[PDB]
Curated annotation (Swiss-Prot), chains A, C:
The lineage of its organism: Bacteria, Bacillati, Cyanobacteriota, Cyanophyceae, Synechococcales. Keywords: Hydrolase. This is 1,4-dihydroxy-2-naphthoyl-CoA hydrolase. CDD domains: 4HBT (cd00586). Belongs to the 4-hydroxybenzoyl-CoA thioesterase family. DHNA-CoA hydrolase subfamily. Disruption phenotype: Cells lacking this gene accumulate DHNA-CoA, lack phylloquinone, and display photosensitivity to high light intensities. SUPFAM superfamilies: Thioesterase/thiol ester dehydrase-isomerase. It comes from Synechocystis sp. (strain ATCC 27184 / PCC 6803 / Kazusa).
From Swiss-Prot, chains B, D:
GO terms for biological process: phylloquinone biosynthetic process. Catalyzes the specific hydrolysis of 1,4-dihydroxy-2-naphthoyl-CoA (DHNA-CoA) to 1,4-dihydroxy-2-naphthoate (DHNA), a reaction involved in phylloquinone (vitamin K1) biosynthesis. Is not active on benzoyl-CoA, phenylacetyl-CoA and aliphatic acyl-CoA thioesters. It comes from Synechocystis sp. (strain ATCC 27184 / PCC 6803 / Kazusa). Belongs to the 4-hydroxybenzoyl-CoA thioesterase family. DHNA-CoA hydrolase subfamily. Signal peptide: none annotated. Disruption phenotype: Cells lacking this gene accumulate DHNA-CoA, lack phylloquinone, and display photosensitivity to high light intensities. InterPro entries: 4-hydroxybenzoyl-CoA_TE, DHNA_CoA_hydrolase, HB-CoA_thioesterase_AS, HotDog_dom_sf, YbgC/YbaW. This is 1,4-dihydroxy-2-naphthoyl-CoA hydrolase. The keyword Zinc does not apply.
Length: 136, 137, 136, 137
């Protein structure tokens, strides 16, 4: 896994006193972006070129226990290529010090050619990076 | 239960790729849920304030079919189902109001738990009653 | 004033139990966008053209009392043109039923020519719309 | 007190105009404040949990000089000052880490109030102590 460290901020939380559900999914996307940056890939780069896009096409998340403002979390990310066009990120979000499981999530991402929005093969650079990140 | 929630896309909903950010569609789903609650005169805040129960969301999922842009007017169509004594399930479709183009489908699952022990409890009866929606066909 | 009605959602609130400070400023920008739309102006339009931009260059807000999830708020918006290039939106955020004052805010906005980002005169259509919205 | 908070711009921070949304800069300011608190082993959550006091933000302002984009690495430089027995003031500058281009300046003011009456109270001593910062020049 790639491990992304994330402190819970006040804005991540809601009036029930705990982290708001989709803020956990925000933390997941951050982990993904940080992994990209570590692999010298750049979401901004592909957006900027715009012969292609790499949209998220699915997200899902199960919640097991709440977190609170100030908590230090770890988001552990591993990724597998599901097909020519599509990869699947798996995330586990835990408390750093106890490894209490808070959530498990997936996001799926596809490459498309623009403007027609038709599936295109994942860039090899993404494929290569995904290979280096070991998935069960 | 069913509900149609009308939602304008604001600048903040969009991202640097020029389209609505994935997570903002899920936010709009929760808003539809909240608007339905309000229409049924139910209140998340009352649950929180009394502090005997919580109604955490325990699962969410969403699939994206097509993008939206700043200024678009969207419809979020919601159906609510009771899955167990303690759990209900919201099903959402998000579409363009004018063209009816389907942008996304989603689900959220919610459970009632007694606090502080966090053990499953029966849904509040008023909530069950709203979900049953016997007042409408 | 233009009056924008806004329900407080769970995501607007934080773990202290109340509306998070900058969510009030989000509601202000929404009121601004709704006013634009009512005047058949379009933030998306100017962004899309990109010979010009109309950025927010200042925001400030004072808080008087908290709000909670489920509250129904009114954001009252009035606007004055401060100079050739710049307008100033004033907002008052209150409880709908009691008119309890929650916050007062300002945002300032300027027109710039791109890509150089040099001040340009407000489009007359914006000037015209601003004139129709009465400011003390 | 002083602090330097390092912040990557994420896709969610940006909007459909292709730049960081104004309100997200203010979010980054509050994060700097929160990171400083953490570095001083202070906790907003502890205040909330105990429920004797609140530390609401009572004023915020921000001016924007230049935009940022997705992927940028920013520095938020924070200075904290005690303005009264019950009030402190955070001053922020946001810059590009590499070029040192100034993007924005901001201020937030915070007050301590006793609950439920919401009357001004003296800052918690540990907070005062952190702001005084006698351990550093």
């Amino acid at each position: 896994t790639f491990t992304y460290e994330r402190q819970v901020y006040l804005a991540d939380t809601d009036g029930a006193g705990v982290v708001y559900f989709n803020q956990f999914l925000q933390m997941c996307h951050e982990a993904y972006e940080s992994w990209l940056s570590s692999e010298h890939l750049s979401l901004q780069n592909i957006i900027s070129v715009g012969d292609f896009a790499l949209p998220l096409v699915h997200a899902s998340i199960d919640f097991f226990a709440p977190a609170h403002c100030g908590d230090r979390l770890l988001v552990n990310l591993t990724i597998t290529q599901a097909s020519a066009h599509r990869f699947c990120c798996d995330y586990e979000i835990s408390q750093a010090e106890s490894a209490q499981l808070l959530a498990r999530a997936q996001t799926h991402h596809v490459c498309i050619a623009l403007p027609e929005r038709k599936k295109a093969p994942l860039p090899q650079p993404w494929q290569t990076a995904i290979c280096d990140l070991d998935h069960p």
